[PDB]
Amino acid sequence: DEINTAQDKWHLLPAFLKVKGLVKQHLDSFNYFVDTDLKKIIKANQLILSDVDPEFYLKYVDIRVGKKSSSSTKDYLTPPHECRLRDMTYSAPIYVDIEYTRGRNIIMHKDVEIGRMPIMLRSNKCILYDADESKMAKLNECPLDPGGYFIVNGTEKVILVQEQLSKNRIIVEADEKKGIVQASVTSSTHERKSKTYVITKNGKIYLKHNSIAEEIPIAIVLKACGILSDLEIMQLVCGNDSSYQDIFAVNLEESSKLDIYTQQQALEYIGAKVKTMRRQKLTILQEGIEAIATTVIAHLTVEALDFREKALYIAMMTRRVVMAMYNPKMIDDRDYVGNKRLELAGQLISLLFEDLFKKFNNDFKLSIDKVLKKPNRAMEYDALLSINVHSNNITSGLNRAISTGNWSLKRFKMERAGVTHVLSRLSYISALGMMTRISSQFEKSRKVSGPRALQPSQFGMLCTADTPEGEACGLVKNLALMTHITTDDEEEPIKKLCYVLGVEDITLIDSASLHLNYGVYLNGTLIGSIRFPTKFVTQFRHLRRTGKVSEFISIYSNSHQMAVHIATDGGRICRPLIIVSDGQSRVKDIHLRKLLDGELDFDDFLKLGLVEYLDVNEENDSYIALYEKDIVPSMTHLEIEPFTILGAVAGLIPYPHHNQSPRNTYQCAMGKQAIGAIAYNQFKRIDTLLYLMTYPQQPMVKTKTIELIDYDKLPAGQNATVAVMSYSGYDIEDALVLNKSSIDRGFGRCETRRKTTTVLKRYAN
């Protein structure tokens, strides 16, 4: 039969899922961690030095997980099922190369293990990578098992995907009877802080930093950041609009109210308010302290004497404030999906390992100082017995953080709980749904229902029915079926490309013409302005479709806020979409014929420019068709399959569009509690609790989802002969009538297996 694009474009979903499984956020994040972020930590903390014995150093040259240079193979890892059975941690050793100086001018390498790295299941370092169900049989592992969790002390722990507001981005919010505050939570690789920004009174605009004693008025900081003309201030923050001028003039007047200002007068004013630095470098208490204050006021770290970038950033901050004060509804929804980011297991473990490695290096330097403080016979030979003994701390911390879920990061200074949860083994669907589960940010003031409502902007990105009941109702969310999470890619080669494509740098731009053209933002920062914003957007999109820039960069244009926005950061949620050009789809069923024939795996639809990822923000600029039949020649994309708006669990529902939505939500709840088949190795497993159906049947009415997630291979239920009638009076209020002699013949017959573990502990005596 000839391929019909309308009803065969759905095969792009199985094509996408073959190479990008449902448990892929965790997988890719952990692979990225262990492959590049470990090198990044070891290259940040590359050398440790001592005050004494200057002719001596320790160098961290290389870092590796699970492999040595002695043999081509990796080390033997006790398989994850054996780790589960023996209540140990599925971990691979971290090997480093050490350059420690010998007293007789000798230079050597080494392969020294500094701890065990808890390895995520089915990652690159995991032994179950690319196994053919035969090695899985030999390893007593289920081929259908999701992977993407950790076995620490024999318990399956999953680092849930974390929801949080996007960092390094301006958010503006109003309020009633209090004023307008709008922050920019800026996070560096070593210091996180939020540059708060509120209107105290009289329409006066202030900058409120934690390190600053009192909120510095806005004209003062604007004059401090090089913009000291006090007309270009009003030009940058006000443009040519008449209302904003009088809205803003009060804090212009205040600038002269105190004393007329040069740049350095404002800089001294800022510096007078810096709190403290734990009484180190006391000789910096001068006008120069404001330089560090402004350097550590945001992410726009300045390493020179030009303050234009930070000045324009603060001017946009102010102008958004002024827009909000002129009229509300210029604020951003804090629950808009475009304003959130998803931290993943790899990023979490990256920061945790960075903290643990800093502790390890501090303690190693302490031990080295204690050893080498001795006057005589300072033999250098075998100076690594300490690190051989001292390797236990990295492993202990790395295991315990995952085991307990509490992550005590001294450097970044917060205590978070519930980062990990025990992977649920009630059902195969329960485990798979604990994967692809998102936990929202706490300290949210649960008394209100902003981040509890379902948003129209989560269409196709977060499942529209898989939201749990009772207390965390709307706080825990689930990923949709056909979704990707962007990864952090370098921003510097895209700024150059933007300059090539006609964007003129802000340092080339004057204040009086800034709000007359569209301004191009890179990750929320005004890098410049451009004529022809729509042409720039089209050329950028053409470059991305031709693969000249990463497919995950998002470009969209805001008309109310005259801006072309380009986003490159990781954590943005995106989904693939068929590109509709000139009123026609780009797939045209020859690509579909190739795809079912075997050629053109899903990646090639991206290399060919037929399919592109859209995040929530680009969906503002897009116009998607649900079906090929209603493609009007003004639409920009076409849905691959609209049933992907439901997650894995909600795909168990037959005909969900014929139900009231609460019924779909409740089935999303109960399907994870359904009793059935767990895994192909369920009788080899020994779990704290396990419910198994004796005679599980696959549903007679299934969906595409349940066969895309192999639910028909381990089903949880049975096809009961049902008569819908009133009977016996014992069926009122949800009560059921069960056939005796169906129960006799095995209908509904299940069993429970419970484990009891004891250890014959040896004692001191």
Binding site: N202, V250, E253, S256, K257
Partner: protein
């Protein structure tokens, strides 16, 4: 009208969200009958009838000139032209900074003069210009807004979104005999503890009558009696 309303009533909180004062009138007409009372209860009217405000300087004299438009003051039914506007300006700019002599050159072009550690004159003139088109000339400065309502008849009652019940009760053209507010503590301080318990009972009953909650009124009576 829900859990927060019942909470407010039984907590006897002094500040409530949406305190509504229901005021019945004496006559039956819109033009020049009920709009007059509505104007008699209004928040602020300077900006409403200023039509501009000036920042005027000369060789040695400074004017804050405002040209009150008789057209707005006539179309919007209010009783004020110049003198009460001037005295209200004096009171408000005294509460802000100072006001000793507010002059009227005539023809609705009332001008305010400022005279006196430097540039303070210009700063105070600017702040007076900013705080000028916000002052109250007509109406009680307790009512955020008034709104004429219809009780499915030809009777145009008005209920005000304010915190002053005695003023609305004593306002001309409002029948004080039938004029109740939904603020129990406002009823208590103006009418008495018996009227306070009546207001409590009526407010609670009405609150649960808008949710279909069929409670015998004796329970509400006992609640009011134990509260008062």
């Amino acid at each position: 009208l829900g859990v927060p309303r019942i909470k407010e009533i039984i907590n006897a909180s002094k500040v409530i969200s949406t305190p509504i004062i229901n005021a019945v009138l004496v006559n039956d007409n819109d033009e020049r009958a009920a709009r007059v009372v509505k104007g008699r209860v209004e928040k602020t009217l300077l900006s409403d009838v200023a039509f501009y405000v000036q920042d005027v300087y000369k060789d040695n004299l400074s004017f804050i000139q405002v040209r009150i438009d008789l057209g707005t003051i006539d179309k919007l039914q209010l009783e004020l032209t110049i003198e009460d506007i001037a005295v209200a300006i004096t009171r408000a700019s005294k509460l802000k900074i100072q006001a000793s002599d507010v002059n009227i050159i005539g023809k609705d072009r009332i001008a305010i003069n400022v005279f006196p550690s430097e540039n303070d004159v210009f700063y105070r003139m600017q702040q007076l210009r900013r705080a000028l088109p916000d002052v109250v000339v007509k109406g009680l400065p307790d009512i955020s807004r008034a709104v004429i309502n219809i009780r499915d008849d030809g009777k145009r009652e008005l209920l005000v979104e304010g915190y002053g019940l005695r003023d609305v009760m004593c306002t001309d053209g409002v029948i004080g005999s039938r004029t109740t507010t939904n603020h129990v503590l406002e009823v208590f301080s103006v009418l008495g503890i018996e009227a306070a318990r009546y207001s409590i009972i009526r407010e609670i009953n009405y609150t649960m009558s808008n949710h279909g909650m069929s409670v015998d009124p004796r329970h509400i009576q006992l609640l009011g009696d134990v509260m008062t």
